[PDB]
Amino acid sequence: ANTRVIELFDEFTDLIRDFIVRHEITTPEYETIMQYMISVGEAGEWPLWLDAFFETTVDSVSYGKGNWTSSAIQGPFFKEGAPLLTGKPATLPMRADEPGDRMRFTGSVRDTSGTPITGAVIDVWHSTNDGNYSFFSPALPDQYLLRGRVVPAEDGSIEFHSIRPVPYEIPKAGPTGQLMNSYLGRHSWRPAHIHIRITADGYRPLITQLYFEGDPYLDSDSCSAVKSELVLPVNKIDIDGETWQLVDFNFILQHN
């Protein structure tokens, strides 16, 4: 027996039941829903699906709100064990010829007093110029491409080089995409983003995302995860024929 489950489950079932009566959900609709749940499972989309609609709320309960950096969902594409980068400067692992503009990120990690948090490790992950994540696409190796950890200098500053991630489309043809495009008449795009996770002894993990100014999807994120402070100004420069996009961000972590 588990009392937590009993408490919650009965109120959950009561609420869905009232929901079924109040919205007149009939036999054929029910079977549609049922078959839809089955197909989400068959496509392995539950993490994708649940993250898209409910994970922002779970984050809220967990991280609260305040002076520190805002959360954004982890999503389903994180992978533990990303390699530590200590090169100067640190570059995420990528293919020779890795497509996209080049990107340089600088920033810092401090608490709310502005003391540097030397004990932090920062995970980074993002998709290819083509909208795929390593480990999650048949078109990419199951290797740590575009994934890495960096540690702050003792003054708290950090830096990593990579490629510029682009807007990402949840597949139109899977059940998650079919809900977003067809049944809801919306779309299934997210704006371009860099995923960040920062942990440190004495501190609450920060899991967040960084977005880019002028992204067409900033106001219609299909996972509803954009916050204004997380949208980054871009300074575009040329070097040797290659465009570099320079972005910067100061992370503040929450005590505990």
Ligand X SMILES: CCCCCCCCCCCCCCCC(=O)OC[C@H](COP(=O)(O)O)OC(=O)CCCCCCCCCCCCC
**Which residues lie near a copy of itself (CB under 8 A)?**
1-2, 4-6, 8-9, 11-13, 15-17, 19-21, 23-27, 29-30, 34, 37-38, 40-42, 46-47, 50, 53-55, 57-62, 179, 182-185
Q: Where are the beta strands (DSSP E) in 201-241?
A: 206-212, 231-232, 235-239
| Residue closer to a copy of itself, measured from CB, 59 or 215 | 59
| Residue closer to a copy of itself, measured from CB, 32 or 243 | 32
161 annotated ligand binder: no
Q: Report yes or no: 105 and 247 within 8 Å, Cβ to Cβ.
A: yes
Q: Give Dmax (Cα) for the chain.
A: 66
When asked if residue 86 is in the footprint of Cl ion (CB under 5 A), the reply is no
Q: Report yes or no: 109 and 156 within 8 Å, Cβ to Cβ.
A: yes
Site string for ligand X, 75-114 (x = CB under 6 A): ----------------------------------------
**What is the bridge-based pairing of β-strands 147-150 and 157-163?**
unpaired
Phi and psi at residue 73, in whole multiples of 5°? -60, 150
When asked if residue 184 is in the footprint of ligand X (CB under 6 A), the reply is no
- The token pair at 193 is 């983003």
Q: What residues pair up with 108 in beta bridges, in sequence order?
A: 157, 250
Q: What residues pair up with 148 in beta bridges, in sequence order?
A: 124
Integer Cα distance of 244 and 106 in angstroms = 13
Site string for Cl ion, 101-120 (x = CB under 5 A): -----------x--------
When asked if residue 5 is in the footprint of ligand X (CB under 6 A), the reply is yes
Give the interface segment with Fe ion, choosing from 38-46, 60-68, 72-80, 100-108 (CB under 5 A): 72-80
Helices (H) and strands (E) in the chain, counts: 4, 11
When asked if residue 20 is in the footprint of ligand X (CB under 6 A), the reply is yes
Smallest gap from Cβ 19 to ligand X, in A, equals 5
When asked if residue 153 is in the footprint of ligand X (CB under 6 A), the reply is no
- Choosing among Cl ion, Fe ion, a copy of itself, none, which partner's interface includes residue 112 (Cβ < 5 to 8 Å by kind)? Cl ion
Count how many residues are written for the chain.
Answer: 256
100, amino acid identity: G
- The token pair at 115 is 């003391």
Given candidates 9, 83, 86, 114, which one binds ligand X under the rule CB under 6 A?
A: 9
DSSP state for residue 180 in the 8-state scheme: I
Q: Report yes or no: 130 and 99 within 8 Å, Cβ to Cβ.
A: yes
Smallest gap from Cβ 224 to a copy of itself, in A, equals 9
What residues make contact with Cl ion under the rule CB under 5 A? 80, 112, 201, 255
What residues make contact with Fe ion under the rule CB under 5 A? 75
What residues make contact with ligand X under the rule CB under 6 A? 2, 4-5, 8-9, 12, 16, 19-20, 25, 29, 32-33, 36-37, 54, 179, 183
